[PDB]
């Protein structure tokens, strides 16, 4: 019966430094602009194929696991378990949508470090994934792409989420979803890496819902991107001509709230929150 905390968690920062070192080995930029410095280097074309990473505890330490069906990530856990390593976590760098993550045991669970604070990001965990296929036409335009998913299935998701929102912010309220107000291309659109290429999918049909068959998302591939590891820009090599396909499960979302009504917009940017959605039941403790 110990106290858990996902926001001040140390494991999150542990794998964040791990993923950064991973991108420097496989996906190396050709040009890097940071702190008024122009850096150029080799830019090999290596395909990014995610593999489940199991984070274990070092010598003289242990990993505690909380088994609560509805644990908000902050407070004393009554069902604590001692494990050797965490579950296979698929390091998927993205925004707005959480891909290939872990689902909820019972029902949807919205988590936040401070619901009252509109600046704090809200992490949503679905209890049922929605498949989304993002492919890139074979050898028109090489930087053009698109994604497909079930319209009706995505409708239910929004509905179920809106129910949890009002269940926390009071019943007598109207929940409305609106696209990102602004910001970098990576934040305004659903961005992610697939086949070594950076996708920027337009997410206006997913986040334009009101209380009162499928969806095709137009996407594009860029070479100039705003680094997520740190502050600065980077330019990668030209896209490959081969077919690029990636079918992934939507297991969660990142929302951000700001005309007296409840308006929620797609969040993202800090990949730390992405790791939190998987390490909200774990914590490293030194053996006595």
């Amino acid at each position: 019966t110990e106290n858990f905390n996902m926001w001040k968690n140390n494991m999150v920062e542990q794998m964040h430094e791990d993923i950064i070192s991973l991108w420097d080995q496989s996906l190396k930029p050709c040009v890097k602009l940071t702190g008024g410095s122009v850096i150029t280097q080799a830019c090999p074309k290596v395909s990014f194929e995610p593999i489940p990473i199991h984070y274990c505890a070092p010598a003289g330490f242990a990993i505690l696991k909380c088994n609560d069906k509805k644990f908000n990530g902050t407070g004393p856990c009554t069902n604590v378990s001692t494990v050797q390593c965490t579950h296979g976590i698929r390091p998927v760098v993205s925004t707005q949508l959480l891909l290939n993550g872990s689902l909820a045991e019972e029902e949807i669970v919205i988590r936040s470090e401070n619901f009252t604070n509109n600046a704090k990001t809200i992490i949503v965990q679905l209890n049922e994934s929605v498949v989304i296929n993002c492919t890139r036409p074979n050898n028109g335009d090489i930087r053009q792409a698109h994604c497909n998913l079930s319209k009706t299935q995505w409708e239910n998701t929004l509905e179920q989420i809106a129910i949890k929102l009002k269940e926390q912010f009071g019943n007598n309220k109207t929940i409305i979803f609106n696209p990102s107000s602004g910001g970098d291309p990576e934040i305004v659109t659903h961005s992610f890496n697939c086949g070594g290429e950076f996708f920027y999918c337009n997410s206006t049909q997913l986040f334009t819902w009101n209380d009162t068959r499928n969806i095709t998302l137009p996407c594009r591939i860029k070479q100039i991107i705003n680094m997520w590891q740190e502050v600065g820009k980077a330019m990668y090599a030209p896209p490959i001509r081969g077919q690029i396909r990636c079918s992934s499960n939507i297991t969660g979302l990142l929302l951000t709230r700001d005309n007296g009504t409840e308006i929620f917009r797609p969040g993202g940017g800090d990949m730390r929150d992405n790791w939190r959605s998987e390490l909200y039941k774990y914590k490293v403790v030194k053996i006595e």
Partner: antibody
Amino acid sequence: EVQLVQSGAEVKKPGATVKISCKASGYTFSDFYMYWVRQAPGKGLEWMGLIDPEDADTMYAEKFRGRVTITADTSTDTGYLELSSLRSEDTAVYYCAADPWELNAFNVWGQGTLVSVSS
Amino acid sequence: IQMTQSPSSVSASVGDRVTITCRASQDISTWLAWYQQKPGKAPKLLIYAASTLQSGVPSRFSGSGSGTDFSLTINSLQPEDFATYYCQQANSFFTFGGGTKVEIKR
């Protein structure tokens, strides 16, 4: 069908600012890169910078990195180049290039724009 | 980000085999393009990807190399092959080489 029409030649004073335009046609202007290159009489080709119109992402050569600016108006399908603090050394023919077939090379070229800088 | 092209000048007769090289300070894989320029005329692309030939360009033009060292060669030298050639970086930036002029030997 696919051609790049630049603006007429100009004349500037040592210290003024010049701005060149380049109208594209025959392809999706906002979906491709636009490149700029200048050549001084007697010398060789010199790359200046590039731009991705839809998001306005730019990359400038180290030499002009500080007094150059490349933009792209997707409303009229025209790219612009701006070089300030002009000197007698900036006298040359400036070209705007593109790559409609995406070959990673300058397949199409404008007629050029002679910019004469002198007191 | 720096391209060195040598020699700087070469003289040959009609029907000869000309070969120019191009060096890159940094490994740019196979992203190098070759151009042909004539006094007064705008540059015309010849070879891209450091091997692939342009549609319309004579077959007597061939290129090779990968990484940092490249080279351009011509099977036979025609009267309209005499000009200046440039090698260009094309992985991220597009820095040009110094260029090489092909003159007639007499």
